[PDB]
Amino acid sequence: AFWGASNELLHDPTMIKEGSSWYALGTGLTEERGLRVLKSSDAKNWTVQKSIFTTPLSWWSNYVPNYGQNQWAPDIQYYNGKYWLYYSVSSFGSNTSAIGLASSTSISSGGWKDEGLVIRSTSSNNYNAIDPELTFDKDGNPWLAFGSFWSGIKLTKLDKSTMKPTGSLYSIAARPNNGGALEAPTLTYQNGYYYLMVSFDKCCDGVNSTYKIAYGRSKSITGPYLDKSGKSMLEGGGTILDSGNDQWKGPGGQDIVNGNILVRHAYDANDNGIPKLLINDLNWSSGWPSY
């Protein structure tokens, strides 16, 4: 079922439970520094907390010299006794970007240790190092998906002791004939399959907001991810979970929480087109994700 939509603005959400509260994190407000943090007791009515990175980290300028003041598209998990917070440092439209990592033993305390650079991109790369997603393979070991535009969604294994990349960089979703207009991966292993969801974006309106949520599955984490029709996500495949409705436009930025909750943003046609946090239960019983 549909849990509801938030009061508070949130874009590119991730969410996690800590004690008697839920925390939802998102892209920082454009006019502020850092990452946006919301807290609630009911996952519906949220209060805005002090942001993460109200002070920027000094190393960011070494990789993204004219980074925008807000950081983007956080991702969080608790693993091996710590919270791991991946996030994006970038500037609007650019593929000169970096994904950073911070760690904590408590979200409510608001203390984060800088773990440094995860992966970066420059104009010389055919991908954009934003929109991280931490996932776990069938052996419980960590991997990172990321990407936005250019040749699309990438995947690397992570070293379980440093939480940074190891091995080769794999390609797992692309839209070669629609301008590379996809972003924001989320990836989970359920019932013997790897599932990849991505946001398909508008390619051609000069704004490139999210538009639909699309999915595919694969027996191996490195793909190919195939949609319900059998089409590979590397060739623009992806079955549409959600294309919005009368009130809620451009759903995207989706993240799978606890295996069976889907959070996402969508833009409120009844409230100035502001992106809000929408949450549904997720069912996998069909072989595929469903509301």
Determine which residue in the list 227, 242, 255, 268 makes contact with Ca ion, applying CB under 5 A: 255
Considering the complex, what minimum distance in angstroms separates the CB of residue 9 from Ca ion? 16
Q: Is 131 annotated as a binding residue?
A: yes
Considering the complex, what minimum distance in angstroms separates the CB of residue 12 from Ca ion? 6
Determine which residue in the list 10, 75, 156, 217 makes contact with Ca ion, applying CB under 5 A: 75
Nearest to 52 by CA among 35, 72, 67, 33: 35
Our CA angle for 171, 126, 162, nearest 5°, is 60
Residue number of the CB atom closest to Ca ion: 255
Q: Is 3 annotated as a binding residue?
A: no
Q: Is 46 annotated as a binding residue?
A: no
| 201 forms part of the interface with Ca ion (CB under 5 A) | no
Q: Which range, of 31-39, 74-82, 104-112, 144-152, touches Ca ion by CB under 5 A?
A: 74-82
| Beta-bridge mates of residue 79 | 82
Dig out the tokens for 284 from the structure. Answer: 């996998």
Instruction: Please say if 8 is a catalytic residue.
Output: no
Q: Which of 8, 12, 114, 205 is catalytic?
A: 12
Q: Which range, of 27-35, 64-72, 212-220, 253-261, touches Ca ion by CB under 5 A?
A: 253-261
DSSP class per residue in the chain: -EEEEEEEE-SS-EEEEETTEEEEEEEPPTTSSBEEEEEESSSSS-EEEEEETSS--TTHHHHSTT--SB-EEEEEEEETTEEEEEEEE--TT-S-EEEEEEEES-TTTT--EEEEEEEEE-TTSSS---S-EEEE-TTS-EEEEE-BSTT-EEEEEE-TTT-SEEEEEEEEE--TTTTT-EEEEEEEEETTEEEEEEEEE-SSSSS--EEEEEEEEESSTT---B-TTS-BGGGT--EEEE---SSEEEEEEEEEETTTEEEEEEEETTTTTEEEEEEEE-B-TTSS-B-
Which residue number, 35 or 226, has a Cβ lying nearer to Ca ion?
35
Instruction: Please say if 31 is a catalytic residue.
Output: no
Interface mask toward Ca ion for 149-188; x: CB under 5 A: -----------------------------------x----
Q: Taking the CB of residue 233, how many other CB atoms lie within 10 A of it? A: 30
Considering the complex, what minimum distance in angstroms separates the CB of residue 129 from Ca ion? 13
Which residue number, 73 or 129, has a Cβ lying nearer to Ca ion?
73
- Residues in binding contact with Ca ion, number by CB under 5 A: 4
Which residue number, 175 or 265, has a Cβ lying nearer to Ca ion?
265
Which residue number, 103 or 269, has a Cβ lying nearer to Ca ion?
103
- The residues that are catalytic are 12, 183
Question: Rule CB under 5 A: which residues touch Ca ion?
Answer: 73, 75, 184, 255
In the annotated binding site for substrate, the residues are 12, 93, 128-131, 148-150
Q: Which residues are annotated as a binding site for Ca(2+)?
A: 75, 133, 255
